[PDB]
Amino acid sequence: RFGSQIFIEHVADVDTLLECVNKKVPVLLSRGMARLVVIDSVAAPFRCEFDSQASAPRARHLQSLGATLRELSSAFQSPVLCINQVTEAMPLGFWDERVSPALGITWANQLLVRLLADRLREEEAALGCPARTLRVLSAPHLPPSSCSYTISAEGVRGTPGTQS
DNA sequence: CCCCCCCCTATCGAATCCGTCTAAAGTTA
């Protein structure tokens, strides 16, 4: 039974997200209802309040959120997946690339495995189909590599024989 | 009253025309 075992929550502020991850996710994880956490965007709440002159409170909030998420994941042996946005690059491993992860080094220090789903739309689009590539940025045990995939009516499928 | 520290962000904005070639078919005392 698929739909009956997926839980949906909605938040609209950084404080709301902090309170939710503090006092709702542990209740769900304690009873064994779920063993997986997905955040559809972490950059969306943060890119609205804190400007370029308020980096200290932003870093404090990011550190607190990362610590809480890592503690929960370690305690309940449940994966945590975070979806992130990108910014424009106008020293951190990004030289021949026009986009970088949004939050910065403070949030990048809290992570374990970093992927980068990319679509090359400006070029090789006249061939008739989109070109989608999933790349491994960093991992303690995974070499940097990439593969190709497509999105169809049934889900995401990886193209065989295309690993870098 | 005493002695030492913190942190990145975010795309924009179109211009500029050139250079000619190849001739064919007689008619009516």
From Swiss-Prot:
Q: Which disease does the record tie it to?
A: Breast cancer: A common malignancy originating from breast epithelial tissue. Breast neoplasms can be distinguished by their histologic pattern. Invasive ductal carcinoma is by far the most common type. Breast cancer is etiologically and genetically heterogeneous. Important genetic factors have been indicated by familial occurrence and bilateral involvement. Mutations at more than one locus can be involved in different families or even in the same case. Melanoma, cutaneous malignant 6: A malignant neoplasm of melanocytes, arising de novo or from a pre-existing benign nevus, which occurs most often in the skin but may also involve other sites.
Q: What is the lineage of its organism?
A: Eukaryota, Metazoa, Chordata, Craniata, Vertebrata
Q: What upregulates it?
A: Stress-induced increase in the mitochondrial levels is seen.
Q: How does it assemble?
A: Interacts with RAD51C and RAD51. Part of the CX3 complex consisting of RAD51C and XRCC3; the complex has a ring-like structure arranged into a flat disk around a central channel; CX3 can interact with RAD51 in vitro. Forms a complex with FANCD2, BRCA2 and phosphorylated FANCG. Interacts with SWSAP1 and ZSWIM7; involved in homologous recombination repair. Interacts directly with PALB2 which may serve as a scaffold for a HR complex containing PALB2, BRCA2, RAD51C, RAD51 and XRCC3.
Native species of this protein?
Homo sapiens
Where is this chain's protein located in or outside the cell? Nucleus; Cytoplasm; Cytoplasm, Perinuclear region; Mitochondrion
Q: Which GO terms describe its biological process?
A: DNA damage response; DNA recombination; DNA repair; double-strand break repair via homologous recombination; double-strand break repair via synthesis-dependent strand annealing; interstrand cross-link repair; positive regulation of mitotic cell cycle spindle assembly checkpoint; regulation of centrosome duplication
Reported function: Involved in the homologous recombination repair (HRR) pathway of double-stranded DNA, thought to repair chromosomal fragmentation, translocations and deletions. Part of the RAD51 paralog protein complex CX3 which acts in the BRCA1-BRCA2-dependent HR pathway. Upon DNA damage, CX3 acts downstream of RAD51 recruitment; the complex binds predominantly to the intersection of the four duplex arms of the Holliday junction (HJ) and to junctions of replication forks.
Could you confirm whether the keyword Cytoplasm appears in this record? yes
**What's the protein called, per UniProt?**
DNA repair protein XRCC3
Give UniProt keywords alphabetically.
Acetylation, ATP-binding, Cytoplasm, DNA damage, DNA recombination, DNA repair, DNA-binding, Mitochondrion, Nucleotide-binding, Nucleus
Tell me its family.
Belongs to the RecA family. RAD51 subfamily.
A cellular-component GO term for this protein: chromosome, telomeric region
In alphabetical order, the GO MF annotations are:
ATP binding; ATP-dependent DNA damage sensor activity; DNA binding
Superkingdom in the source lineage: Eukaryota
Q: Where primarily located?
A: nucleus
